[PDB]
Paper text:
The PIWI-clade Argonautes (PIWIs) bind 24–31-nt PIWI-interacting RNAs (piRNAs) to form piRNA-induced silencing complexes, which silence transposons and maintain genome integrity in animal gonads. In contrast, Piwi co-transcriptionally silences transposons in the nucleus, by facilitating heterochromatin formation at target transposon loci. The Piwi–piRNA complex interacts with nascent transposon transcripts and essential cofactors, such as the zinc-finger protein Gtsf1/Asterix (Arx)13–15 and the adaptor protein Silencio/Panoramix (Panx).
These results indicated that the purified sample represents the Piwi–piRNA complex core (residues 34–843) lacking the flexible N-terminal region. We observed relatively poor electron densities for the PAZ domain, indicating that the PAZ domain is flexible in the present structure. The 5′ phosphate group of the piRNA is recognized by the side chains of Tyr551, Lys555, Gln567, and Lys593, and the main-chain amide group of Val568. We observed an anomalous difference density in the vicinity of the 5′ phosphate group, where we modeled a zinc ion derived from the crystallization solution. The zinc ion is coordinated by phosphates 1 and 3 in the piRNA, the side chain of Gln589, and the C-terminal carboxyl group of Leu843. The present structure revealed that Piwi has the DVDK (Asp614/Val653/Asp685/Lys818), rather than DEDH, tetrad in the PIWI domain, and that Val653, corresponding to the glutamate finger, adopts the “unplugged” conformation. A structural comparison between Piwi and Siwi indicated that the structural features, such as the N domain orientation and the metal-dependent piRNA recognition, are conserved among the PIWI-clade Argonautes.
Residue numbers in the entry: 93 to 272, 280 to 346, 361 to 370, 380 to 648, 655 to 687, 690 to 843
Write the structure that this text describes.
RNA sequence: UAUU
């Protein structure tokens, strides 16, 4: 297996009495009461059990004290001094396996979090007082804490994580003032979010005949909107002339209406492990000093441990990266970029770069020649025979000029087309990719002008040569794979920039890497559309190997909703694998279905630092019902590691869990755009890359001639 | 769009 270690976490133990159980009763009153809240008060009258925290819904009762039998209390109610007889009938104990166990624990912990007086939303606690406003980006970022609870045979654990909820400063009242019928045309059909209650509404009309001074009727009381929002949310309405949004009746003053913004926010969110540990200990000490939360915690006779729990784990040994003539170890820092310097790629076309073209404008011939010299040198050092491409010098840097050059050049049937661009323009890049992959079938390479002027142009040209070798459909390196007839599938999905109502699903499939070591890639728009792609992959596999694969490892990017995706995806997959292998009158293959999730909620560290690549936590902090584990595969220079969560829904592989984990760590070594281990298995990162390319730039399905090439890299 |  690997080298075992002990790792710091972000969980604290909830210690209770050694013999500590939860008692559930059903409660009823001799004088019947049509209102449950009155019953709650009537039971609250009993102080013998009041000091102990108890959960009463008007019928179900959860408490700690176990009574002698079915027990009955009696007293006089506050209203009319009516003699009431409460019949508290014993139901039983909540088993450690019942989900009501964790539901009761969640309600208790939420009651405790209430003492901190933080806005509670789902499993998150926010501090709106501590909002970070940004008028530069017109957005407010609220810090907060994400919470989770885990059950183990040894105890009960409670974990926290830093979280940031972002929202837009722009309000619908501001949009209406910018327009000032046209306001109604601009506002109707939009979705707004109330800043006092995490609810969104579709505005269907705007009533100009009503104001915040108008009144509505609740369940019994009549009240104005100003009074309602001052008494229910302590929110003051300053503008009295504004109209009302009718969806419910909302106030516009109180209604609120990516990849570079992600960079800015990451600059504001990247955190050293020590800083995250400090903020976590601060939150713990805050909850510990608050007497309101401590009262709730102590009433149930359970104590937070101000000390962090640590887990047993193991670090996978370094894996061997194979090239033509030899193989190298990955290293303690799982990066091998230093190694292809004076090393040859695994699979190289004997033809080499026998026919390709280069399109560039007349102004940038000098930088183009520099780039081409670097490419020749680097690709020759890699084993890639590159010859002189076809010169395609255009005059203007416009998009139509590039498109026309491509269409005039394709007539010579080139293996590849490299295009030198002036700047970082998504428009011309998307148009180039669309003309290359969708309308025609030519793998292309784009180089930003700033790249040519880079001082370290030689290592850049080496990485570009690796990318080009992949674009041709050849293999730069390979892992040691002790399995026969294995097909690894990755699959992911992406939203579209042109239309948010469509999504693209990309599927990547290996072809018995110990022999063929190539990949097959399909995309389709969102009638389950994934099985056609799986069938295409199996057909290509049997057309290349004269046989179907014996084992299949399916990596799924998603996620709880496990039950839904388990049922639908896995059941249909198994039935249709039965069917497809029955077409060949064969038995269905060994199948492993794993859901890959980047769990930013659960973290763990080694000696207070980021764990090294290959670290694994199996079945301690993981979910009890699931057969799953955590893996750290990609080391991070800066920031905090987000471990990957691999959840094996179905497994008929006949492989030990350690073997499955080692195979997954191996498959994490095969993303050719990155000279090291990636955060996810390689096929999954390929699927994400292809789906993002289709949904962001291509907006259409690429031609089927590129099925065996890494054109999307 | 060398890479994310
Ligand atoms: Hg249990
Ligand atoms: Hg307008
Ligand atoms: Hg009311
Ligand atoms: Hg050409
Ligand atoms: Hg899909
Ligand atoms: Hg993925
Ligand atoms: Zn019950
Ligand atoms: Zn050779
Ligand atoms: Zn050739
Ligand atoms: Zn120069
Ligand atoms: Zn995904
Ligand atoms: Zn255990
Ligand atoms: Zn488009
Ligand atoms: Zn690329």
């Amino acid at each position: 297996d690997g080298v075992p270690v002990m790792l710091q976490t972000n969980f604290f133990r909830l210690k209770t009495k050694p013999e500590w159980r939860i008692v559930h009763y059903h409660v009823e009153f001799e004088p019947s009461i049509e209102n449950p809240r009155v019953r709650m008060g009537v039971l609250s009258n009993h102080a013998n059990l009041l000091g102990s925290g108890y959960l009463f819904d008007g019928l179900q009762l959860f408490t700690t004290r176990k009574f002698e039998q079915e027990i009955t209390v009696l007293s006089g109610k506050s209203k009319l001094d009516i003699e009431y007889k409460i019949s508290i009938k014993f139901v039983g104990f909540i088993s450690c396996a019942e989900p009501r166990f964790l539901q009761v624990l969640n309600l208790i912990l939420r009651r405790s979090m209430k003492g901190l007086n933080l806005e509670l939303v789902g499993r998150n606690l926010f501090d709106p007082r501590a909002k970070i406003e940004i008028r530069e980006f017109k957005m407010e970022l609220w810090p907060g804490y994400e919470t989770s609870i885990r059950q183990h045979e040894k105890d009960i654990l409670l974990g926290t994580e830093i979280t940031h909820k972002v929202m837009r400063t722009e309000t619908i009242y501001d949009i209406m003032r910018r327009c000032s019928d046209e306001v109604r045309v601009n506002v109707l059909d939009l979705i707004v979010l109330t800043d006092y209650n995490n609810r969104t509404y579709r505005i269907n009309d705007v009533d100009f005949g009503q104001t915040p001074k108008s009144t509505f009727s609740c369940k019994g009381r009549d009240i104005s909107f100003v009074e309602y929002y001052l008494t229910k949310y302590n929110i003051r309405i300053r503008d009295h002339n504004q109209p009302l949004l009718i969806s419910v009746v909302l106030i516009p003053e109180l209604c609120r209406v990516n990849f570079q913004l992600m960079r800015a926010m990451s600059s504001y969110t990247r955190m050293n492990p020590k800083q995250r540990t400090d903020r976590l200990r601060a939150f713990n000490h805050r909850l510990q000093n608050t007497p309101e939360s401590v009262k709730v915690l102590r009433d149930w006779n359970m104590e937070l441990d101000k000390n962090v729990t640590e887990v047993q784990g193991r670090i996978i040994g370094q894996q061997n990266i194979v090239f033509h003539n030899g193989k190298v170890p990955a290293g303690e820092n799982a990066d091998w970029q230093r190694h292809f310097r004076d090393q040859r790629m695994l699979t190289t076309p004997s033809d080499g770069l026998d026919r390709w073209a280069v399109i560039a404008p007349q102004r940038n011939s000098h930088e183009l020649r520099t780039l081409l010299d670097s490419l020749y040198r680097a690709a020759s050092g890699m084993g890639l025979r590159i010859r002189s491409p076809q010169e395609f010098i255009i005059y203007d840097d416009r998009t139509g000029t590039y498109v026309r050059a491509m269409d005039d050049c394709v007539r010579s049937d080139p293996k590849l087309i490299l295009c030198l661009v002036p700047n970082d323009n998504a428009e011309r890049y998307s148009s180039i990719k669309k003309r290359g992959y969708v309308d025609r079938a030519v793998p292309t390479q784009v180089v930003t002008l700033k790249t040519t002027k880079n001082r370290s142009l030689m290592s850049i040209a080496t990485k570009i040569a690796i990318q080009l070798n992949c674009k041709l459909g050849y293999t730069p390196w390979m892992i040691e794979l002790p399995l026969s007839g294995l097909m690894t599938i990755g699959f992911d999905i992406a939203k579209s920039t042109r239309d948010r109502k469509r999504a693209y699903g990309a599927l990547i499939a290996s072809m018995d890497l110990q022999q063929n070591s190539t990949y097959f890639s399909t995309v389709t728009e969102c009638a389950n559309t994934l099985w056609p792609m799986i069938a295409k992959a199996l057909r290509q596999y049997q057309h290349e190997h004269r046989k179907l694969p014996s084992r299949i490892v399916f990596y799924r990017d998603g996620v709880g909703s496990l039950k839904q995706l388990f049922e639908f995806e896995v059941k249909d997959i198994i039935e249709k694998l039965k069917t497809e292998y029955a077409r060949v009158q064969l038995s269905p293959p060994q199948l492993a279905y794993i859901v890959v999730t980047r769990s930013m909620n659960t973290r763990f560290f080694l000696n207070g630092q980021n764990p090294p690549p290959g670290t694994i936590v199996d079945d301690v902090i993981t979910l009890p019902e699931r057969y799953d584990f955590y893996l750290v595969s990609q080391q991070v220079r800066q920031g905090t590691v987000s471990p990957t969560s691999y959840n094996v829904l179905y497994s008929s592989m006949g492989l030990s869990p350690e073997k499955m984990q080692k195979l997954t760590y191996k498959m994490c070594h095969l993303y050719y755009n990155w000279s090291g281990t990636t955060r996810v298995p390689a096929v999954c990162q390929y699927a994400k890359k292809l789906a993002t390319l289709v949904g962001t730039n291509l907006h259409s399905i690429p031609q089927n001639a590129l099925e065996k090439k890494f054109y999307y890299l």
